[PDB]
Paper text:
Native SAD (single-wavelength anomalous diffraction) is a de novo macromolecular structure-determination method in which the phase problem is solved by exploiting the anomalous diffraction signal of light atoms present in the crystal. Here, the combined use of these two strategies is described to solve cases of native SAD phasing that were particular challenges: the integral membrane diacylglycerol kinase (DgkA) with a low Bijvoet ratio of 1% and the large 200 kDa complex of the CRISPR-associated endonuclease (Cas9) bound to guide RNA and target DNA crystallized in the low-symmetry space group C2. Here, we present two challenging native SAD cases solved by collecting low-dose data at multiple orientations from three crystals each: the integral membrane diacylglycerol kinase DgkA (Li et al., 2013; 2 × 42 kDa asymmetric unit, space group P212121, 2.6 Å resolution) and the large Cas9–RNA–DNA complex (Anders et al., 2014; 200 kDa asymmetric unit, space group C2, 2.2 Å resolution). Here, we show that multi-crystal averaging of data sets used in conjunction with a low-dose, multi-orientation strategy is beneficial in difficult cases where data from one crystal are insufficient.
Residue numbers in the entry:
A (entry chain D): 34 to 120
B (entry chain A): 25 to 119
C (entry chain B): 7 to 68, 72 to 86, 90 to 123
Write the structure that this text describes.
């Protein structure tokens, strides 16, 4: 999950884009990492309370995962738009 | 996750902004900023709701830190909304 | 609009407690505000201005979400307790490091 970031930075570097584009390409990937980290923290808290299933436990994890999904969608859109424009 | 509640209004506001941003005659960089700033609001709202779910999971008995966690989560949503408004204002002010 | 009113109120409570309770949060708040004001007065294009502002504001957003998580953990009273705080703090640090780099990249180009 950490190799994805490095690969993206390398691509952003290997690409001949201006500083602004490079910042957006990289920051969009960093945001995904941030959100995953926050989602995992919440999952850790849920599991801390106990292993017994609960409606609100699943809810918390679903909300967290949805946030990761939105961040990934935001990253894909970003890379699609800037590379379409670059080329 | 459960798009059948108050995530409706939040989510259509976001969705509508993405659609508007998709149609605007702006450069690529601007379009990305318009879309991601509203996208961030959705992300932060989702994380905020998740925290609220964990708090409610623990129980109904009130605790100072329970209210604090929820208050902190809301403040984050507020900052994200202010960031989106500022973004759209700065970028669109030319139009 | 009554929902937004109550939500605005929780928010102010959140900012207020964060501020009152830790100097580190207050000093971080000063830093962000100083960066927004500088960004607001720099001779840069609209796009660059937004990146300068949204990077340090993301820092504030992540700081608050992480603090929310700390509050939940502390509320419960713990290997996963430590793990939750660890994952949360990493998130804060990524946000901060990204803001600093973003500011260094952009200002080096415009200066
Ligand atoms: C009840 C009214 C709701 C209105 C929703 C908000 C509408 C905001 C902006 C509408 C203008 C859409 C953008 C049109 C435009 O810029 O065209 C792009 C350009 O390619 C035209 O050739
Ligand atoms: C953890 C450190 C936080 C520091 C927060 C306060 C410093 C933030 C940014 C410092 C760089 C901006 C200073 C350069 C500057 O202001 O140039 C002004 C420009 O208009 C001159 O023509
Ligand atoms: C021209 C090819 C460009 C290749 C790089 C495009 C990458 C765009 C978005 C990646 C953002 C996601 C970061 C990695 C991640 O955590 O997602 C993994 C998911 O399982 C699927 O992406
Ligand atoms: C999700 C399925 C539909 C496929 C669309 C995904 C492509 C990613 C973002 C599309 C939203 C922006 C469309 C507007 C547009 O003109 O994009 C091109 C940019 O202006 C230049 O790169
Ligand atoms: C100089 C910048 C001016 C921009 C300020 C625009 C702010 C407009 C509306 C702020 C949002 C109103 C409160 C909404 C809110 O409280 O968020 C919801 C809760 O935080 C969680 O649901
Ligand atoms: C002329 C540009 C200035 C106007 C800004 C246009 C709108 C830009 C960003 C709005 C994004 C916020 C939508 C989400 C939202 O409002 O949720 C509110 C909920 O009630 C909060 O819990
Ligand atoms: C639609 C009402 C928006 C309510 C919030 C207003 C306060 C927030 C931002 C004010 C924007 C001030 C003008 C920005 C502007 O002119 O951008 C131009 C670029 O900075 C060019 O470098
Ligand atoms: C448009 C820029 C907004 C950037 C975010 C502002 C920085 C975040 C928090 C600091 C501002 C919150 C106010 C602090 C506060 O409530 O003070 C309470 C009193 O000092 C206690 O009596
Ligand atoms: C006491 C701290 C208050 C913090 C200030 C928050 C203000 C946030 C955003 C202000 C909007 C930025 C204005 C940008 C601007 O003036 O553009 C002017 C351009 O030069 C016009 O082309
Ligand atoms: Na931001």
């Amino acid at each position: 999950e950490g190799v994805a970031v490095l690969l993206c930075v390398v691509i952003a570097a290997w690409l001949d884009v201006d500083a602004v584009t490079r910042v957006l390409l990289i920051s969009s990937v960093m945001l995904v990492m941030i959100v995953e980290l926050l989602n995992s923290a919440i999952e850790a808290v849920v599991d801390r309370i106990g292993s017994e299933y609960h409606e609100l436990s699943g809810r918390a994890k679903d909300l967290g995962s949805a946030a990761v999904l939105i961040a990934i969608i935001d990253a894909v859109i970003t890379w699609a738009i800037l590379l379409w424009s670059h080329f």
